[PDB]
Design a protein around this ligand. Structure first.
Ligand SMILES: *[C@@H]1O[C@H](CO)[C@@H](O[C@@H]2O[C@H](CO)[C@@H](O)[C@H](O)[C@H]2NC(C)=O)[C@H](O)[C@H]1NC(C)=O
Ligand SMILES: *[C@@H]1O[C@H](CO)[C@@H](O[C@@H]2O[C@H](CO)[C@@H](O)[C@H](O)[C@H]2NC(C)=O)[C@H](O)[C@H]1NC(C)=O
Ligand SMILES: CCCc1nc2c(N)nc3ccccc3c2s1
Ligand SMILES: CCCc1nc2c(N)nc3ccccc3c2s1
Ligand SMILES: *[C@@H]1O[C@H](CO)[C@@H](O)[C@H](O)[C@H]1NC(C)=O
Ligand SMILES: *[C@@H]1O[C@H](CO)[C@@H](O)[C@H](O)[C@H]1NC(C)=O
Ligand SMILES: *[C@@H]1O[C@H](CO)[C@@H](O)[C@H](O)[C@H]1NC(C)=O
Ligand SMILES: *[C@@H]1O[C@H](CO)[C@@H](O)[C@H](O)[C@H]1NC(C)=O
Ligand SMILES: *[C@@H]1O[C@H](CO)[C@@H](O)[C@H](O)[C@H]1NC(C)=O
Ligand SMILES: *[C@@H]1O[C@H](CO)[C@@H](O)[C@H](O)[C@H]1NC(C)=O
Ligand SMILES: *[C@@H]1O[C@H](CO)[C@@H](O)[C@H](O)[C@H]1NC(C)=O
Ligand SMILES: *[C@@H]1O[C@H](CO)[C@@H](O)[C@H](O)[C@H]1NC(C)=O
Ligand SMILES: *[C@@H]1O[C@H](CO)[C@@H](O)[C@H](O)[C@H]1NC(C)=O
Ligand SMILES: *[C@@H]1O[C@H](CO)[C@@H](O)[C@H](O)[C@H]1NC(C)=O
Ligand SMILES: *[C@@H]1O[C@H](CO)[C@@H](O)[C@H](O)[C@H]1NC(C)=O
Lengths: 772, 772
């Protein structure tokens, strides 16, 4: 099927449209650039390997290279692996790049380089040198970059990669880079804004440095600047999770009132963690296009009640005023200036970490007529009191976020407090209006608590303290609710009428409501599903369900049931038949997850008891030690079977004879040591087979008929125990010449033996001695 | 050190005391009785093997056998492994036991026997046949048991081991068993009490059967009976976790009013789950010695408010009325009859599952003058209101249990509801008075909540809804508290004054209070420990701690700190030195658990940062990929180092150079593939070494000098990858001949090769070809 097997340890892709031959050698544990890279190579990535030097031999035949991605072949010690530390810096010999006359993009990040590499071709638009050791920039070393448009030099002098001096930039070092659009000098122990910069700049990143003052003319010529980030200069260090040095005397970064006067094109201004106490309106006199303003992690608590500068921001789309609270102050309420009402274009307002006790309808009145307002984020404010009905005036919003508060009767986890959220490494909103009350202190709910909110489509009550029996009266206003996240509470299913007032409910999450399931003898009405006539998806993961008063759950609508992390092993205790049809009357059910239920065996009757349209079944992570494969015949619509992370030792003698419908068979992470002689014979439906991470020693042709392998979209075989003796001649030859997609041939389809061949990839294996 | 290596795959112990030779072959995957069993063997256990038959050859030389424990060599099929089912029942040939003329105890449980084995010696006092298929007892078949004292025949006909008919016992089958003290016929589908029974009986177990009526004279001659259990006849089936058939007409077990008149000696009466609605006082007029009465799982809800029968029980110690509630009734209060006040000897009263809304001092008055009352258990009652001060009147008690209730302003998990609490298979109480409020709904605490309870020594608040900052004022009444379990709440360590009013506190558990530690930017005062001057043990496990406002925790008293399941990997992020002395000022800390902290490496300074008296250090389950063993020099009092379940690949070149103090080195479950040349040389201090579940191939004498192994109390070596070539000659020889204790030599210390030897035990390995 192939005449010339591919030995090269890299994935090779063709994009015929834009004549790219893409060679990806990412993370292939290479010590040398592999031989045989196609000479038509346009994109070549060698990121995360251990190639210790580059030379003219490196790319010698690769004349058409347009991009070389050579990041992280010698990561700085504190940022890289401690088990495989890099012994010496990358070495780049002369002329290594000069012949590549079409090279447009060169990334050399994370290689412990000490200088800007010279000899670069004049075609280069993008040079990336992050996380190296270059902390002195001289105009001489930048003459070669005449046509450069994007230049990343950050992370070369900071706490994860110290240089122990101030960064240095000669005057007008960048000024003759006349074509330069993007300059990044973040995380560099820079002490002043470098001047003069080329007026072609559209983006300037100077954040996380030691710039204490802006000079009035530091940005005088940047009439095309669109994004400017000065954050993390004079940081606000309270509860910082990284080493943090504030400016002396609690000074802020000092910005003259006229410092921005030239930036007419500015669209994004970021002044995060600059220890600001005031925001002069004069700052924005000449910026009418500003769309995004980050003022998080300053000391603007008082200014938020005044905030005259908002009158100069009629086109602002995003405003972030999070974490401006005064230390050790717990304000009574939020004092939002009337000036917010002049934010006519505002879509997103974030004020986390203002820290106040009580939220009242009128305090949000400055926002009532912001017509384009879509997201209001008041999370992490320790609000104790809030009448939810006030959001009846905010029905136009897409998300109201009150997450992580103490109310009673999507951004990264680390976001406002991480050092460099843009650091490069080597959900129910779609349903409509969302009220996020997650991680609050609601211990009891009542119908009137939701009143005037019948417009809500998604309500997140995850992670409250609700230890209550529901009887159908608690949610009555919520006539349009489609999604209820009730996870991480203490739901008590005493009555089978719970949730029945949510007539339009399509998704219910009651996972991690294990509390009342963990004490013996307590009544549990699992048959509450019957009353929910449009319910599509039910999640009850991690509930430790080991007993149930009702014997059957019923639904004519339910399509997906997640039941992972429970104790079906106890419910189905061998000899107890009462619950073998717990799911039989979920008539429309197509997907069932009963992984992690400690099912080390399946009792008689489990398969016969499944609902008739079951398509996707997971029995993963059960400690399954045995499996009667014939009983799949009961599952006449079964299309996906996930048996991963179990203890199986055998596959069926004839998979076609067990399931005529089975299309995807997942057996990864088991104990299988051999395949049956006619395993896949006539399994014409099979499309996907994962046998990886087992203990298979040999595979013979009878098990793998090629009319079956031809239809496989993927066949996974890596991390097994293959013996590369002359008995493996067909398997080795087939693996080398087949077109079937088999991931990891280059890294993890290997011989364990015999002696000579140990550790060797079967793709590279030469068995001519077997036919002498 | 030994002249004759032990081949026998059984543990052999001598108790010269009573001259017994104990051979224990439990769970050794035997298909045979091993050859070579010592001929002095007195106790021989073969439990959990797959020996298919017994014969006269089985024990023929084992003349002095006093006990044969042969359980579970063919378990009933729903009770045993489904991956290794037993193919055919155990076969016992004639004459197998007749020569064993000293045999006193014979266990044959769980072998699928169809009849009581005949031919047994007349010395036998104890015969055990539980979980077989013997469901017809004939007087003829018990002639051989003249001198029997203890006879277990239960679990031969029940839902885990069905016989599909009623149990049958011929009339007077047991009466000529004139020495029979204990007869157990539980779990047997028995329909009537067998008569006549021998009057020597002291214990009679008839529970979990189908007995509908007791006859007047069913116990007429029992004269000496001390324990009688009739539980589970006419069971109360509501929320039963096993198949449960109630008696018709909701009838109770019918017991005539005079049925117990002969039982002068009766000390324990068990009538659990008999569906009783009344307890006629006349039952007890002739039993004044009764000490333990179980009336749980009946319908005694109203009877508890009357209970005149309590007047006849002045010597009762334990009384159980748990789960007597009327279905679908949520009573307003608990109505205890005054008759309780006449239980002058009562030590333990349990009334779970009475199910009522409000508890008031006034309802507990019948117990005020019960002088010996030690345990009051009102758990699982769904109590919503309870003034804790009422217990000022119960300070003589050892435990007050309000666990699993809804209060807001040790028995097995499965106990009242499991089928057979006594089924045989193949804590702060010690600190003083304990108020157990675990698993309630307390969301806010205040000093007055504890008024008048200054006597408390242990308070259990685990698993409430406490989401509160503590400032040192909340517990002030609890002047003598020694133990506070605050686990599974949402503690907010805003103030370092938390818990300081507990001036006597020795153990503080704030594990699983992760909530506020999981959201970025929140203040955490881990240095709150300084104020706790007698604090001994601090558990802050599973808190997801990844940030801290203070840099150091301080205590002059704390000895043990459990810090497992947190994120020291983040706190000690490489490049951030600020928290490398988090534990340095716990001056007298001796045990530190920092397992499960994702520490894939230890930054330099962690060890120097440890407090000076650190004795027991766990770094288990961190994914540690490397370890600078030399830094153990900083830990000069280190005695236990637990590095289990990591990814280490090497041991120190010179363990004596790394620690002159280390006694226990646990390296189980790592990736170690060889030992260093002189690993343990001069490690005279080492006493315990676990290298199990690694990839070690060979061990040479240089690494294992015998001056070091002589002192080892245990050396764990199993589940490695030993190569049994002529290079292994010394290791094989030493293992076969050594004194030193090595677990699993018979089952999991094995050669992986070379061919022929694969799978073979190194204890059985013959390497004579290596010396031809
Ligand atoms: C940023 O530059 C400062 C100096 O401007 C470096 O600080 C010096 O560091 C050395 C070595 O730690 C000290 O001996 C000097 O006293 C420091 N000088 C001053 C003025 O503080 C600092 O190390 C640089 N930062 C990084 C992360 O490399
Ligand atoms: C206990 O004995 C009863 C009979 O007393 C068994 O019930 C019979 O079971 C067979 C087979 O299932 C049925 O055909 C009979 O009709 C049943 N008879 C009655 C009267 O119920 C029962 O199976 C036995 N229980 C156990 C656990 O072995
Ligand atoms: C053995 C207890 C049987 C019961 N189960 C529950 C329950 N899940 N919720 C309640 C809520 C209020 C009152 C009583 C209850 C009871 S009583
Ligand atoms: C917002 C980040 C700084 C803060 N941390 C906490 C905290 N642990 N508990 C509180 C309790 C009440 C009010 C405010 C707080 C704050 S404010
Ligand atoms: C390939 O490299 C070129 C040159 O930098 C780049 O513009 C393009 O986006 C890359 N495409 C892929 C698929 O790698
Ligand atoms: C809110 O704060 C502003 C600025 O500090 C102050 O001028 C104003 O009086 C305050 N108003 C209210 C209603 O608190
Ligand atoms: C909450 O506000 C609404 C106004 O929309 C009002 O009807 C209701 O009474 C308020 N509830 C409370 C408890 O203040
Ligand atoms: C609800 O919020 C929790 C916690 O913030 C989050 O994990 C979950 O994804 C949210 N639910 C939905 C449906 O988005
Ligand atoms: C359900 O409970 C609520 C609150 O306890 C109550 O208002 C309502 O009447 C109850 N419904 C029924 C049918 O009892
Ligand atoms: C659910 O099952 C319980 C337990 O048998 C039953 O009492 C109740 O009526 C059922 N309810 C529904 C809605 O099916
Ligand atoms: C499986 O194979 C046997 C033998 O060919 C055949 O009789 C049977 O119909 C096949 N299919 C099923 C679903 O049993
Ligand atoms: C040995 O067996 C005898 C006979 O049943 C038993 O009484 C005794 O407790 C056992 N002793 C030991 C040390 O195992
Ligand atoms: C308590 O229950 C008893 C028993 O039925 C009844 O006679 C009595 O009236 C009840 N007393 C109270 C105070 O409820
Ligand atoms: C407190 O109660 C919990 C919940 O039942 C229990 O797990 C824990 O062991 C108790 N604490 C102590 C110190 O006994
Ligand atoms: C705990 O540490 C914080 C911050 O380092 C400090 O403000 C506070 O006073 C300390 N409290 C103690 C040591 O009790």
């Amino acid at each position: 099927a192939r005449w010339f097997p591919k030995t090269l340890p890299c994935d090779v892709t063709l994009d015929v449209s834009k004549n790219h031959v893409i060679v990806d050698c990412t993370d292939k544990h290479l010590t040398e650039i592999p031989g045989g890279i196609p000479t038509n190579t346009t994109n070549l990535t060698l990121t995360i390997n251990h190639i210790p030097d580059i030379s003219p031999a490196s790319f010698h035949r690769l004349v058409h290279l347009v991009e070389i991605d050579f990041r992280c072949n010698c990561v700085p010690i504190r940022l890289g692996s401690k088990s495989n530390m890099c012994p010496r810096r990358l070495q780049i010999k002369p002329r290594s790049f000069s012949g590549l006359t079409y090279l447009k993009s060169l990334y050399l990040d994370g290689n412990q380089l000490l200088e800007i590499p010279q000899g670069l071709p004049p075609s280069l638009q993008l040079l990336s040198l992050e996380a190296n050791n270059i902390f002195s920039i001289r105009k001489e070393q930048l003459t070669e970059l005449a046509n450069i448009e994007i230049l990343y030099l950050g992370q070369n002098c900071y706490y994860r990669n110290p240089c122990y001096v101030s960064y240095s930039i000669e005057k007008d070092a960048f000024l003759n880079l006349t074509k330069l659009k993007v300059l990044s000098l973040k995380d560099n122990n820079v002490t002043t804004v470098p001047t003069v910069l080329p007026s072609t700049l559209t983006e300037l990143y100077l954040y996380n440095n030691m710039i204490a003052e802006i000079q009035e003319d530091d940005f005088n010529n940047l009439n095309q600047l669109q994004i400017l980030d000065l954050s993390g200069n004079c940081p606000r260090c309270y509860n910082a999770p990284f080493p943090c040095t504030p400016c002396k005397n609690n000074s802020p970064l000092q910005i003259p009132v006229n410092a921005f006067d030239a930036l007419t094109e500015l669209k994004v201004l970021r002044l995060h963690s600059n220890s600001l106490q005031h925001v002069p309106p004069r700052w924005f006199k000449n910026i009418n296009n500003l769309q995004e303003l980050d003022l998080s992690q300053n000391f603007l608590a008082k200014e938020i009640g005044d905030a005259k500068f908002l009158h100069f921001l009629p086109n602002l789309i995003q405003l972030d005023l999070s974490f401006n609270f005064e230390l050790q102050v717990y304000r009574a309420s939020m004092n939002l200036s009337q000036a917010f009402s002049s934010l006519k274009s505002l879509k997103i307002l974030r004020i986390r970490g203002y820290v106040f006790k009580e939220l009242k309808s009128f305090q949000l009145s400055p926002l009532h007529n912001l017509q384009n307002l879509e997201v209001l984020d008041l999370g992490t404010n320790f609000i104790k009191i809030a009448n939810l009905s006030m959001f009846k005036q905010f029905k136009r919003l897409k998300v109201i976020d009150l997450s992580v508060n103490k109310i009673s009767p999507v951004l990264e986890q680390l976001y406002y407090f991480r050092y460099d959220k843009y650091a490069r490494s080597c959900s129910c909103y779609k349903y409509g209006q969302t009220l996020d009350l997650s991680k609050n202190s609601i211990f009891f709910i009542k119908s009137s608590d939701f009143q005037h909110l019948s417009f809500l489509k998604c309500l997140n009550l995850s992670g409250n303290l609700i230890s209550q029996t529901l009887n159908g009266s608690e949610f009555q206003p919520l006539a349009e609710l489609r999604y209820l996240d009730f996870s991480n509470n203490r739901l008590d299913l005493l009555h089978s009428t719970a949730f029945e007032e949510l007539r339009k409910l399509e998704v219910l999450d009651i996972s991690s409501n294990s509390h009342y399931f963990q004490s013996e003898g307590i009544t549990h009405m699992l048959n509450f599903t019957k009353n929910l006539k449009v319910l599509q998806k039910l999640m009850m993961n991690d509930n430790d369900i080991s007993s149930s008063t009702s014997r059957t759950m019923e639904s004519e609508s339910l399509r997906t049931l997640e039941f992972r992390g429970n104790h079906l092993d106890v419910l189905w205790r061998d000899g107890d038949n009462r619950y073998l049809q717990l799911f039989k009357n979920l008539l429309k059910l197509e997907e069932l997850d009963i992984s992690k239920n400690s099912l080390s065996f399946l009792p008689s009757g489990v398969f016969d008891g499944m609902p008739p349209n079951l398509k996707n079944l997971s029995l993963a992570k059960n400690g399954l030690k045995s499996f009667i494969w014939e009983k799949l015949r009961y599952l006449k619509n079964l299309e996906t079977l996930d048996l991963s992370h179990n203890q199986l030792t055998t596959v069926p003698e004839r998979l076609s004879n067990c399931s005529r419908s089975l299309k995807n068979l997942i057996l990864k992470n088991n104990q299988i040591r051999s395949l049956t002689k006619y395993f896949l014979q006539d399994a014409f439906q099979l499309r996907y087979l994962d046998l990886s991470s087992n203990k298979i020693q040999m595979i013979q042709k009878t098990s793998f008929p090629e009319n079956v392998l031809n239809n496989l979209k993927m066949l996974l075989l890596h991390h097994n125990r293959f013996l590369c003796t002359c008995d493996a001649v067909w398997f080795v030859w087939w693996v080398q010449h087949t077109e079937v997609t088999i991931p990891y041939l280059a890294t993890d389809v290997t011989c364990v033996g015999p002696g000579a061949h140990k550790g060797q990839s079967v793709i590279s294996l030469d068995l001519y001695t077997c036919e002498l």
